[PDB]
Design a protein around this ligand. Structure first.
Ligand SMILES: O=[N+]([O-])c1ccc(S(=O)(=O)O)cc1
Ligand SMILES: O=[N+]([O-])c1ccc(S(=O)(=O)O)cc1
Ligand SMILES: O=[N+]([O-])c1ccc(S(=O)(=O)O)cc1
Ligand SMILES: O=[N+]([O-])c1ccc(S(=O)(=O)O)cc1
Lengths: 727, 397, 395
């Protein structure tokens, strides 16, 4: 009933102003930061303002909600939400019920309420705007509008689910706005219905809002301040679950979502769909209360804590010079030179020119370098028809990519990114033929998968400017850039590649030099557990199903063909040689027997035409039918959860080893690096968070991770034994 | 144990087709009343006060079929107001479950004479018109891993290795044995033609039958969004691809129909001068996985044979509803059922599957075929959604 | 041969129709919550021995369609062999499910069966299923369909039950229900409803108005041609005295109930204590225009079937659909006033159609044990003119 939490004290965030017409202007200006956010201060501040709008309603004709910041209103207090324990469900429920009670009063005041959206209105901010009767957005660079709480394992618990279903129906609200937390530019926001009007600048917002209140009261006095769903003849778009047109396809919505998530344990889209459908069956207030319960179900959960730790806290520290050297200034980059025009080098030239840099794309012949720039043309021709870029913009993009085969065309290059074959001699030869033509103060980067950077750095004169800049195919999609630090690599170079990573719109992690680095080494334990399971006799279909239901983007056998089993065998030949001649004994992984068995059958992967799958006419066909007879598949039928856990634990344990060996310097880089680089499932929050935030039938936390690891060690092998650092 | 339950009459209507059907203009309440009036015509001197209940299976108790359609049948037919009337819904075996409950009511000794059967006018009340406790609950639908009946049958055929030609062979076989049964006059005394309020004929035959079916005709048919494949394979992770072999010609037909069975004790029949036509030996209920949805009959048939103290060799006639050809083929292969004892007079692929009434229709079919062959025992069973099963064993008197 | 025993009998609180606490709760959730409670009371129960789950539901559409009994089996995680069947005998659906379960136990072809009902009337109002006496004017015109409310008024008119007479019974039920709650009678059987987070939703029958006065009951106003249709059949009465209001009629509420019924062998095999024995069941009825009448021949039948008379029964429990129905039942069989609906009835707590027969069944199971008494008789009136009755004996 009350608009307040309690039923010394928080600060105040809302300014009050009542003009001579009777229009109140609520300006949100939280003094504890540059962005209005949903916290104790706002809840108590809006509580007072809503109480005052009721007490003085005789002398009030309309309300205008505005912001004094760059942004309108952005999100909530993650520092407080990430601490909600299962025993805090009552307080979480009462909070969002209080937050929505204020908006419900503001919404049913009998007077028009207009949102003066200046900057970004994301999450809790858009939920305030949706409580208004009319929304005006200033079309300005940077402004965004959306409800992205699903990307943190939450749901729009401030009426976002209940109101968007009221505005667009169950299907459109779930697909477009809710289930993926889509952010919208103000132009697209007006196109879909989240925003009603647009203005040129922010100075016109408040005056255009009062002009709308004036016309609305004069032209539509009966329905002024009444939302469409608060009218007698309201009909939900697309129908309600009782209407037969929707009840025919509604039972298919959960199964379609189960297909989208590939059976992964992510609870937020499931809860959003339930709250939406259950809400459409009842009145607005009962629907809003159901929305609160599903919100308290997610905030007190473990997956939401993993996502909030990874995509909020961990990502903020990385993007704020967390791993970047401190006392290093900037050094802008003029022209880029890319050695090699494969799907890697041609993709590096695309993202470098998509950011605005001039690129020189060298290969062996002009015939191949022109096919390297042809990788950027196809990604531009597709962007023209879909409508993301313009014609004058796509022409200026490809014009920065000058393909060549002449080593002399690298004159005037201050950033070198090599992407040729993984051969230490070839890289020594390639960098030796280029180090004297480029600038003296250039960056010499090497897109390397496994070869140590210290060894590669011997074949150049200035070893300070030699560094590993590991990209991921396809470069136009993968957002991580693994930056490797050789022994002779200088801190000054770390920053220049760090800043280059942010310039192309990518996320950096700093890694110390060692074979496998962090991404390739950890993803090796992922494919090795699946190949071992295949040799042990597990069904190939069950293996891929376990990899998809675990949360990975690509199943492991499918990924092995993309990685090419010729490269996998070579890595074992080198790793076996670096221990035998070093005066030791090599314990070969059981997956190596499966690797060589496929090589012997002439099935090295997708590059050579046939691997674990078959590949007719480019696209991938089904599994190779002879795979079952080759490995006696079916004789081993372990639990699916054991297959899933063996893949998750192999990477989680190997990640802890990298943190032990000093390969990674922070848990934040371990999480984002695992998620964005090798595709570790987002619901885990990273292969390091997977340990401390583990949950299963055994228990919760690091203690339960160890217990489940020892359970796998008893039945599968020693490699699932936790290191001392976790004991 | 206590009292023994006997079948005294078991009739049904012709099954009118869905598209341009002859029974589409007939309210389902009238289909039941018509069978009630036929029982009166066969026994004019019966004291209807002894009838203590009317139990009708109905999977979609909505619209023309809502409001306890069994009670409306008691009142509309002018039956004694003390004769009760109750609708039940166990999906596909609602018809047989009604007969089973009627027999179990007589066995308990607290009911003498009971009418039982089912009704389903699928051309007027389509499947799913009742909504669904799970259909509108996405939180439950998500967790229970729900897969429709058709995709389970495609999966059953994929696992057990039944090709498109294999299931189309059984479909042709059912179309033949049904046409042979109609020509031989096997159904003439139990299929009661539907007539209007003026006595004019509306339908006298199962008009869904396609008696001129050929192996080539079934091969030309096509298999019937959603994502239920990705859901089914998430549970059966060892299966790569589902082979969609089922079409509109190898699956049961959408039809309208009704069925009525009169069940009572031996004292009830002797008191009313009724000749027992068969005896209910045993019933049972079991099932298997809910995603495959259709492997329910297998443990239900074993549990009813184990209860009656019989084996597969002791059963003269097997009657399994032809919801999908792969389900019958699996049931045949698993129990090693002789092909000369299984659905000998055709099944739902030829004549139709009026959900709530199918159980009582195929029960009355075996009561007649046992007398015509002068055989001893018959076993009737049906698959059900969620992985349910209901089996019944009868013995000719 | 086999005897049927009641091992557990629980129910949810009954949430009212207007601004009710259970309006946001799916009727499927109500049944699952009762299943989770039976598991808590017997965690080492082998659920594979449960062969069927029989639920009564008068309006099986929307949230209550698609065989809600089967959904309670799958959603709760019970074995897929546990059956699941929904039935509908109007107001007796709850008691019919219990009786049918007991009859399936006696036949020997069922070992352990759950039985009960569910009716979320605030989400699925009665009549949502349609019916063959509204969409078919030909049969409606012939059977002389008259609602239950008018038959109750007609019963009071014929029997001489004044407006003060029926309101006196309404006050009597409100008092006896408040006394039973405060006395802790319902503490063990009424299972409070909670959400997905364990937060409390409802823990009491909120339709109760325990501060009711006879002065306030007389302030109430009573509840299409049905008056003339009824008198066409009952031509000896000139006018129908409308005496029933929302204060002396049953309450429209949400709720569910569950009963565990099985054989003595199944009870021993699973370590369950039998709380009562189902002696006999019976069905009958009377005229379909006055409708409600029907319990009286159904009660005489179950008494004659068990070789018992009125003087052999310790407690009588008849559903308080309308006040005149209970007063007519009490007048006919000459029920002592202190034996009838001793812990209150539907007038105070509610009548969730599909589950009511199973709620009053469990209410008598508790009161027999609380008083250390022998027998009790449970019955309900039904639309269309039916009626079912059950006699239980304490063990
Ligand atoms: O952002 N929040 O969800 C939030 C909830 C509760 C509180 S408070 O109860 O500590 O005032 C503050 C912020
Ligand atoms: O609404 N909320 O997200 C919320 C989070 C945490 C807390 S608590 O930890 O202060 O109990 C209260 C409310
Ligand atoms: O700016 N952001 O990246 C952002 C992410 C999530 C949220 S929310 O989940 O708290 O609504 C708000 C803002
Ligand atoms: O893809 N792989 O199978 C793979 C195996 C081992 C290594 S490692 O020796 O560098 O750790 C890297 C990659």
């Amino acid at each position: 009933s009350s608009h307040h939490h309690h039923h010394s004290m928080p600060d105040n965030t809302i300014q009050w102003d009542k003009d001579a017409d009777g229009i109140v202007t609520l300006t949100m200006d939280d003094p504890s930061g540059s962005t209005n956010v949903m916290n104790e201060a706002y809840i108590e501040s809006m509580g007072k303002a809503v109480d005052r709008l009721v007490a003085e309603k005789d002398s009030i004709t309309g309300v205008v909600v505005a912001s004094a910041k760059k942004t309108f209103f952005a999100g909530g207090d993650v520092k407080t939400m990430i601490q909600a324990r299962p025993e805090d469900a009552g307080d979480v429920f009462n909070t969002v019920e209080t937050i929505k009670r204020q908006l419900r009063t503001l919404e049913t005041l009998g007077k028009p309420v207009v949102a003066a959206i200046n900057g970004a209105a994301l999450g809790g901010g858009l939920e305030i705007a949706l409580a208004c009767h009319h929304r005006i957005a200033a079309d300005v660079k940077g402004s965004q509008l959306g409800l992205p709480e699903v990307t943190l394992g939450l749901l729009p618990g401030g009426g976002g689910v209940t109101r968007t279903v009221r505005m667009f129906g169950i299907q459109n609200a779930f697909v477009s706005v809710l289930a993926q937390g889509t952010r919208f530019k103000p132009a697209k926001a007006k196109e879909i219905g989240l925003v009603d009007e647009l203005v040129a600048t922010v100075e016109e917002l408040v005056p255009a809002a009062k002009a709308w209140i004036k016309e609305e009261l004069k032209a539509n006095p009966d329905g002024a301040g009444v939302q469409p769903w608060d009218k007698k003849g309201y009909k939900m778009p697309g129908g309600t679950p009782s209407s037969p047109g929707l009840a025919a396809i509604l039972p298919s919505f959960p199964s379609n979502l189960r297909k989208q998530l590939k059976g992964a344990p992510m609870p937020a889209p499931r809860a959003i769909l339930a709250a939406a459908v259950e809400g459409a069956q009842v009145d607005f207030d009962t629907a809003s209360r159901i929305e609160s319960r599903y919100f308290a179900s997610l905030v007190t959960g473990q997956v939401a804590k993993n996502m909030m730790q990874a995509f909020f806290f961990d990502l903020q520290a990385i993007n704020a010079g967390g791993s970047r050297p401190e006392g290093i200034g900037k050094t802008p980059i003029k022209r880029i030179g890319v050695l090699g025009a494969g799907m890697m080098g041609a993709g590096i030239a695309y993202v470098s020119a998509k950011a605005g840099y001039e690129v020189v794309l060298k290969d062996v012949s002009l015939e191949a370098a022109a096919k390297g720039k042809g990788y950027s043309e196809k990604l531009e021709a597709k962007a023209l028809e879909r409508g993301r870029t313009t014609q004058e913009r796509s022409d200026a993009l490809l014009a920065r990519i000058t393909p060549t085969a002449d080593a002399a065309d690298f004159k005037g290059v201050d950033f070198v990114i090599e992407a040729v074959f993984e051969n230490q001699e070839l890289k020594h030869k390639v960098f030796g033929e280029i180090e004297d033509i480029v600038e003296p103060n250039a960056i010499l980067g090497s897109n390397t998968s496994t070869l140590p950077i210290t060894g590669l750095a011997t074949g150049v004169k200035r070893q300070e400017d030699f560094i590993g800049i590991h990209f991921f195919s396809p470069v136009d999609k993968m957002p991580l850039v693994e930056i490797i630090k050789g022994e002779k690599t200088s801190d000054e170079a770390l920053a220049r590649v760090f800043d280059y990573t942010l310039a192309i719109g990518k996320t950096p992690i700093v890694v110390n030099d060692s074979r496998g680095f962090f991404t390739s080494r950890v993803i090796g334990t992922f494919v090795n557990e699946a190949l071992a399971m295949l040799g042990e006799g597990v069904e190939p279909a069950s293996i891929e199903q376990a990899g998809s239901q675990a949360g990975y983007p690509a199943p492991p056998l499918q990924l092995s063909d993309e990685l090419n089993l010729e490269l996998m065998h070579k890595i074992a030949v080198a790793t076996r040689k670096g221990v035998e001649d070093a005066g030791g004994t090599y314990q070969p992984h059981p997956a190596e027997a499966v690797v060589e068995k496929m090589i012997e059958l002439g099935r090295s992967g997708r590059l050579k035409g046939a691997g674990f799958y078959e590949y007719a006419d480019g696209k991938r066909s089904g599994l190779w039918p002879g795979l079952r007879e080759t490995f006696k598949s079916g004789s081993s039928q372990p639990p699916l959860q054991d297959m899933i856990d063996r893949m998750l634990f192999a990477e989680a344990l190997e990640t802890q080893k990298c943190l032990d060996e000093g390969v990674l310097t922070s848990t934040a880089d371990a999480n984002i690096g695992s998620i964005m680089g090798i595709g570790f499932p987002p619901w885990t929050g990273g292969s390091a968070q997977f340990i401390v935030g583990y949950s299963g039938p055994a228990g919760t936390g690091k203690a339960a991770f160890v217990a489940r690891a020892r359970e796998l060690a008893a039945a599968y092998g020693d490699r699932f034994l936790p290191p001392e650092s976790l004991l | 144990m206590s009292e023994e339950a006997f079948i005294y009459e078991a009739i049904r209507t012709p099954r009118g087709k869905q598209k341009n059907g002859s029974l589409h203009e007939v309210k389902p309440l009238s289909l039941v009343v018509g069978l009630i009036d036929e029982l009166r015509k066969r026994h004019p001197d019966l004291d209807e006060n002894l009838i203590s209940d009317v139990i009708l299976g109905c999977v979609s108790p909505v619209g023309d079929q809502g409001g306890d359609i069994a009670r409306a049948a008691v009142l509309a037919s002018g039956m004694p107001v003390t004769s009760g009337g109750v609708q039940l819904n166990r999906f596909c075996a609602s018809g047989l479950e009604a007969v089973n409950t009627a027999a179990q009511k007589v066995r308990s000794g607290w009911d003498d004479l009971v009418l039982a059967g089912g009704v389903e006018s699928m051309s007027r009340v389509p499947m799913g018109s009742d909504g669904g406790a799970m259909g509108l609950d996405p939180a439950t639908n998500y967790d229970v891993m729900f897969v429709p009946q058709s995709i389970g049958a495609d999966l059953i055929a994929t696992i057990e290795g039944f090709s498109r030609e294999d299931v189309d062979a059984y479909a042709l076989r059912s179309q033949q044995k049904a046409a042979e049964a109609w020509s031989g006059g096997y159904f003439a005394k139990s299929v009661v033609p539907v007539r209007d309020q003026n006595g004019l004929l509306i339908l006298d035959h199962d008009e869904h039958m396609r008696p001129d079916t050929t192996k080539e005709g079934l091969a030309k048919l096509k298999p019937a969004l959603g994502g239920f494949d990705d859901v089914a394979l998430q549970k059966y992770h060892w299966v790569e691809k589902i082979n969609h072999v089922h079409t509109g010609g190898n699956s049961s037909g959408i039809v309208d129909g009704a069925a009525l069975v009169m069940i009572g004790s031996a004292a009830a029949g002797k008191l009313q001068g009724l000749t027992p036509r068969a005896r209910i030996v045993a019933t049972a209920t079991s099932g298997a996985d809910p995603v495959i949805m259709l492997t329910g009959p297998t443990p239900a048939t074993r549990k009813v044979l184990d209860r009656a103290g019989l084996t597969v060799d002791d059963i003269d006639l097997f009657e399994l509803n032809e919801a999908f050809a792969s389900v019958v083929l699996k049931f045949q292969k698993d129990l090693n059922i002789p092909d000369e004892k299984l659905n000998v007079n055709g099944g739902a692929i030829a004549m139709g599957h009026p959900l709530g009434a199918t159980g009582a229709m195929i029960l009355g079919t075996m009561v007649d075929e046992l007398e015509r062959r002068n055989a001893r025992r018959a076993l009737i069973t049906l698959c059900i959604g969620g992985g349910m099963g209901v089996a019944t064993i009868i013995e000719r008197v």
